[PDB]
Design a protein around this ligand. Structure first.
Ligand SMILES: [K+]
Ligand SMILES: [Mg+2]
Ligand SMILES: [Mg+2]
Ligand SMILES: [Mg+2]
Ligand SMILES: [Mg+2]
Ligand SMILES: [Mg+2]
Ligand SMILES: [Mg+2]
Ligand SMILES: [Mg+2]
Ligand SMILES: [Mg+2]
Ligand SMILES: [Mg+2]
Ligand SMILES: [Mg+2]
Ligand SMILES: [Mg+2]
Ligand SMILES: [Mg+2]
Ligand SMILES: [Mg+2]
Ligand SMILES: [Mg+2]
Ligand SMILES: [Mg+2]
Ligand SMILES: [Mg+2]
Ligand SMILES: [Mg+2]
Ligand SMILES: [Mg+2]
Ligand SMILES: [Mg+2]
Ligand SMILES: [Mg+2]
Ligand SMILES: [Mg+2]
Lengths: 85, 99, 64, 132, 63, 202, 101, 138, 146, 66
RNA sequence: GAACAAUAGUAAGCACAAUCAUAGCACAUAAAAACGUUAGGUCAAGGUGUAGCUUAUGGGUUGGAAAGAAAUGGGCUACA
RNA sequence: AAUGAGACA
């Protein structure tokens, strides 16, 4: 069902419903301002739930003159990072 | 139609590989069944559907590894979080109406 | 926009020299009709609109 | 009123790129096709497989480069090699771009079992054709 | 040429009429390999060998 | 942050050789092309967009790697891998005289991960009957035996084979039909004397 | 996951037909020929009908690979008419343009 | 000034097998845009002239495929949106071409094929009579 | 090797090492995913077949204890799996070919009874007196020149 | 030698071809008279297409008001 | 918010126009047709807000949705 | 050619 998904702008343009016939002649008396939240405000390219440290994206490529390799993250360490978000 | 024509027609059929002996109109179908590829074995039929299981699973695994970011799946999770906060979530097994 | 026109004029002459160099012709007689047939070959744009095809002409003739 | 692949007029404050500023009936008149391949010729087969692979790249490239993608991709298929041309904003550090370039080239090559070419052109911001 | 695979068949009964139609169709089939074609011939041998009593009461005795 | 370096167009020489820049087919790089090219429908009062950041110049399959300067250089190096056509076979009439059999085969190239085209297995074999050794009786039998494959006007015989999966198998099968038809037209079998006066071609 | 439960059933139906495609062809050859004795043909009808129901070429349904619309699907592109226009109007399909004559 | 001295190293092993002679080779390129085919023809003709092939180029008539689809997603069958697929043809004939020359010409042509076009090659190979026919056997 | 885009064109020799190795890490990162989940790349639409794009396998395809399965682990650059399986084979009483024993020693001797360098799981004598190479060499019934 | 079309299409086509072919044998003054009679002018009337949603080129389906 | 022998209007954006397609032009036909109106039609192309179901409003198997008293719309074939 | 509107600002 990967092909069934859509774009972020398409989803918010439909959920907000700020372009229909309701908000034309005062038909919409909701009086509650629906707020749009940008879901990309907090992004760390490479970070994931499994906690994989990819050299180049999050961790620096070279460490003390030695190029780092692919490595995972400790369970306690990953929990703290998620708690930060 | 003469006996000379019958011999020539059969002799030509033998060389080119067609059926020599006379055959009924309905009896020619068995030749067609093996001459052509069956419908159920054509590549257009059994490979009609792209494997959505591989497509969905691969992108789901890449999502958790931080290499692919899907906006649409993030939208569902964000709205699902708000439903739990509002107090309207999905009950566990055996909790719908038996209580 | 006098200076912008002047910049376009000088680089068009330089660009004409490069086009003549790669086309293997005489740069002193690289006429506009030769440029049009040269551009139409290097960039074969199939479009029905005659004005939508790539062009490289005198900036005086292009800019209003 | 027709609404297929159009951006509606809203004063003069919303920028529009060249691709989005033309109605679909201008295809093959003012703008070309974003993808070119042999599948949609007259007497050529293998057209559905090309289409589904094309859609996946539209969804993969958009998610691989979040936010930094300028506009639609351009897909060229020559022989058995696949060429992908993209316009990417100056958002990520150059270290991350090469990481994604290497990641994309290898992953797609081993998935579609064909060589993949990924060429990038970087622009400071989205190019504006009208309004603004 | 698939005649060498029809040695063990009744030469005069309707089986010869039926089998030669199958071989003629297999001759014109480009999509099937040689090993796969023998499978069809072998299956017919198995099918006729399993069902022998029915051919006895069919009206003509077939070997 | 990181800045944008000036394009190499400024450093490009006036008389540098173009094909060294583009050895193979590559997309249109605005920085790598010294030519100032503008395309796209212009505004009501304006000019077409520039070559930087323009998708219209990117969709087009460029021919910068096939410049006429490069074509002559490319083709000349390939002249080693060639052998001359014999001069005696100049007129097409002599080609028929020295070679009476022509065979038609097809190969198909398409964009995709696969090359298997089922229409590439066809083999067409055409032979002029006047160049063979058929007798008066044998030639008449061959026409009556092959059916509609023989043209009475051009006196050409066309054999088409499609059952064999491969072109080489079809080619071996196509020539097999030609030789078995010739050896059979000379066998005056006993039943051939039972000719009807209505079946005579003359 | 496929886009709908209907699409999932079609995959199983196509898979089942492929396994029994050759066996059905051999048995159906006996039925479609009148030179074999009628007694053998009656036995053949019992065996061909004893095969699983899902192993039938006719039961195969052509849907859209994207939205699984049971009808309005072009066979060449295997896409629904709504999805086909969505891709064509954006210029994402090669050689496809609005018809004008 | 500094150039790689003698950076060419191809080998052409001349075997004893006679070369294959083609009576006439036909190349038919098909595409959507005439401009690409016009430039591709010029490239092919220029290369063919240098090799000395004496080719002839003609344009086969084009054909247009049309189909009609519904406009809206529900009812409204009186409004239709039509589409059109245009395939343009161009044929290049090669006469008196040897097998060795045919291989290099085709691969050089095929490698530079634009992504938006495809082609079909019809080779009319010529050869003498078969051994059984040539050798007198009744 | 580097992109022709000016923003991505390296500006110094320091950038060249950083840029090129970043791209190299991308290939290793992608190949890690391919090998981690082989079932997501088993589909083949390549004609003719390209064996250089199919996913590879490192885990022993045969989980049974046999001499044939032992040879697979040796050829797959596996040291811990080979030595443990070799001990099980010896305890089973089944004979082991001398050439296979020599092949096992070569893999262990080169790496010093250690694992090779993988993507992810100087001074002094690296050779150790208490090493498995000397232990197995003594246990060899017949020792050849090799 | 005329090809394509019906009996009247061929008859009209041959008529037009003869008028243009006979201009060589006729003096220039009567060539003008040929134009004034409509011999030398080609007929631009060609069959039109069928619009989608209509029975014919101009005819539409029955329009039920209510 | 216009008076041309001119009296408060100005220059751009969208639409009309022009251009493009139907292989000459022309004409004609296609194509186009903004901002809005009818809370017009489509939660059953697909996605999704809110509300509801969770051993059931979910999933699978087998069999079955007949029938026209009558009224009407659009069509084919006719009444030569 | 008499009649019609409800819970739209
Ligand atoms: K809903
Ligand atoms: Mg709506
Ligand atoms: Mg759904
Ligand atoms: Mg059906
Ligand atoms: Mg009518
Ligand atoms: Mg105003
Ligand atoms: Mg106007
Ligand atoms: Mg016109
Ligand atoms: Mg007009
Ligand atoms: Mg209209
Ligand atoms: Mg207009
Ligand atoms: Mg309503
Ligand atoms: Mg109404
Ligand atoms: Mg309704
Ligand atoms: Mg739904
Ligand atoms: Mg409903
Ligand atoms: Mg929902
Ligand atoms: Mg149910
Ligand atoms: Mg009535
Ligand atoms: Mg109607
Ligand atoms: Mg009648
Ligand atoms: Mg009243």
């Amino acid at each position: 069902s990967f092909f069934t998904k859509l774009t972020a702008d398409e989803l918010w343009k439909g959920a907000l419903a700020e372009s229909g016939a309701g908000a034309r002649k005062g038909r919409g008396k909701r009086t509650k301002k629906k707020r749009r939240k940008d879901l990309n405000r907090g992004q760390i390219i490479g970070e994931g739930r499994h906690g994989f440290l990819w050299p180049g994206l999050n961790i620096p490529l070279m460490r003390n003159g030695a190029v780092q390799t692919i490595a995972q993250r400790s369970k306690e360490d990953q929990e703290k990072v998620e708690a930060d978000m | 139609l003469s006996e000379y024509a019958v011999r020539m027609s059969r002799l030509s059929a033998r060389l080119f590989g067609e059926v020599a002996r006379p055959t009924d109109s309905k009896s020619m179908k068995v030749v067609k069944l093996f001459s052509e590829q069956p419908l159920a074995k054509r590549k257009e039929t059994y490979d009609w559907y792209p494997n959505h299981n591989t497509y969905f699973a691969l992108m789901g695994t890449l999502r958790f590894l931080g290499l692919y970011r899907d906006e649409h799946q993030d939208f569902r999770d964000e709205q699902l979080r708000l439903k739990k906060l509002r107090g309207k979530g999905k009950p566990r097994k055996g909790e719908g109406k038996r209580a | 926009t006098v200076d912008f026109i002047k910049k376009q004029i000088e680089e068009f002459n330089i660009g004409k020299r490069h086009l003549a160099n790669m086309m293997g012709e005489d740069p002193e007689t690289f006429t506009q009709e030769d440029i049009d047939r040269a551009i139409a070959y290097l960039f074969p744009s199939g479009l029905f609109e005659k004005r939508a095809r790539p062009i490289m002409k005198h900036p005086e003739e292009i800019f209003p | 009123k027709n609404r297929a692949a159009r951006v509606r007029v809203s004063k003069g404050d919303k920028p529009v790129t060249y691709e989005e500023a033309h109605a679909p009936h201008y295809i093959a008149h003012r703008k070309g096709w974003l993808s070119l391949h042999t599948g949609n010729l007259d007497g050529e087969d293998h057209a559905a497989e090309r289409t589904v692979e094309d859609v996946f790249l539209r969804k993969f490239m958009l998610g691989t480069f979040p936010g930094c993608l300028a506009d639609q991709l351009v897909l060229k298929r020559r022989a058995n090699q696949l060429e992908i041309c993209a316009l990417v904003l100056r958002q990520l550090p150059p270290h991350k771009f090469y990481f994604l370039v290497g990641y994309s080239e290898t992953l797609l090559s081993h998935f579609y079992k064909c060589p993949v070419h990924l060429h990038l052109q970087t622009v400071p911001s989205k190019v504006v054709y009208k309004y603004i | 040429f698939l005649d060498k695979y029809l040695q063990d068949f009744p030469k005069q009964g309707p089986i010869r009429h039926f089998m030669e139609l199958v071989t003629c169709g297999l001759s014109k089939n480009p999509y099937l390999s040689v090993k796969q074609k023998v499978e069809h011939i072998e299956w017919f041998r198995n099918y006729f060998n399993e069902k022998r009593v029915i051919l006895k009461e069919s009206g003509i005795q077939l070997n | 942050r990181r800045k944008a370096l000036p394009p190499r167009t400024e450093k490009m020489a006036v008389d540098q050789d173009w094909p060294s820049v583009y050895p193979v087919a590559a997309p249109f790089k605005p920085s790598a092309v010294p030519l100032p090219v503008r395309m796209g429908y212009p505004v009501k009062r304006g000019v077409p967009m520039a070559k930087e950041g323009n998708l219209e110049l990117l969709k087009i399959p460029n021919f910068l790697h096939l410049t006429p300067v490069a074509i002559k250089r490319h083709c000349e190096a390939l002249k080693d891998f060639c052998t001359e056509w014999p001069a005696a076979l100049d007129s097409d009439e002599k080609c028929e005289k020295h070679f009476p059999i022509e065979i038609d085969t097809a190969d198909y190239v398409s964009a995709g991960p696969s090359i298997r085209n089922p229409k590439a297995r066809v083999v067409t074999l055409r032979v002029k009957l006047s160049s063979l050794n058929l007798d008066d009786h044998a030639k008449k039998k061959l026409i009556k035996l092959v059916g509609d494959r023989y043209c009475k006007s051009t006196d050409v015989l066309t054999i088409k084979t499609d059952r064999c999966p491969l072109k080489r198998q079809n080619y071996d099968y196509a020539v097999y039909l030609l030789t078995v038809l010739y050896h059979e037209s000379w066998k005056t079998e006993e039943w051939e004397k039972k000719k009807t006066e209505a079946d005579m071609e003359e | 996951y496929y886009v709908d439960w209907k699409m999932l059933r079609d995959v199983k139906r196509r898979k089942m037909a492929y396994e029994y495609a050759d066996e059905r062809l051999r048995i159906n050859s006996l039925r479609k020929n009148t030179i074999l004795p009628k007694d053998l043909q009656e036995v053949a009808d019992e065996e061909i009908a004893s095969l699983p129901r899902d192993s039938c070429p006719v039961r195969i349904r052509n849907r859209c690979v994207m939205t699984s619309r049971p009808r309005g699907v072009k066979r060449r592109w295997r896409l629904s008419r709504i999805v086909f226009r969505h891709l064509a109007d954006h210029g994402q399909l090669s050689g496809v343009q609005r018809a004008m004559w | 000034v500094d150039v790689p001295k003698d950076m060419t190293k191809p080998e052409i092993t001349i075997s004893d097998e006679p070369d294959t002679l083609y009576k006439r080779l036909s190349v038919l390129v098909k595409g959507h845009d005439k401009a690409v085919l016009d430039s591709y023809e010029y490239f092919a003709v220029l290369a063919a002239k240098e090799l000395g092939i004496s080719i002839k180029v003609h344009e086969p008539p084009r054909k247009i495929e049309r189909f009609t689809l519904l406009k809206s997603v529900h009812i409204f069958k009186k409004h239709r949106v039509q589409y059109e697929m245009r395939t343009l043809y161009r044929c290049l004939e090669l006469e008196h071409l040897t097998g060795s020359t045919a291989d290099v010409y085709l691969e050089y042509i095929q490698r530079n094929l634009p992504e938006g076009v495809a082609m079909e090659v019809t080779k009319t190979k010529l050869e003498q009579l078969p051994e059984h026919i040539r050798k007198p056997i009744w | 090797v580097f992109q022709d885009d000016p923003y991505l064109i390296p500006t110094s020799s320091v950038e060249s090492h950083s840029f090129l190795l970043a791209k190299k890490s991308g290939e290793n990162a992608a190949k890690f995913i391919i090998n981690s989940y082989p079932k997501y790349f088993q589909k083949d639409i390549a004609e003719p077949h390209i064996p250089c794009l199919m996913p590879e396998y490192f885990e022993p395809q045969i989980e049974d204890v046999s001499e044939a399965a032992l040879q697979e682990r040796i050829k797959l650059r596996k040291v811990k799996a080979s030595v443990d399986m070799f001990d099980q084979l010896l305890q089973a009483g089944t004979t082991v070919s001398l050439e296979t024993t020599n092949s096992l020693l070569d893999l262990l001797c080169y790496y010093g009874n250690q694992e090779p360098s993988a993507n992810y799981n100087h001074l002094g004598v690296t050779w150790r007196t208490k090493n498995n190479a000397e232990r197995i060499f003594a246990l060899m019934p017949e020792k050849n020149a090799h | 030698a005329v090809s394509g079309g019906g009996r009247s299409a061929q008859a009209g086509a041959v008529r037009l071809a003869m008028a243009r072919a006979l201009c060589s044998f006729v003096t220039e003054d009567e060539v003008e008279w040929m134009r004034q009679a409509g011999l030398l002018t080609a007929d631009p009337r060609v069959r039109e297409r069928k619009k989608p949603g209509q029975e014919g080129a101009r005819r539409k389906f029955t329009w039920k008001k209510r």
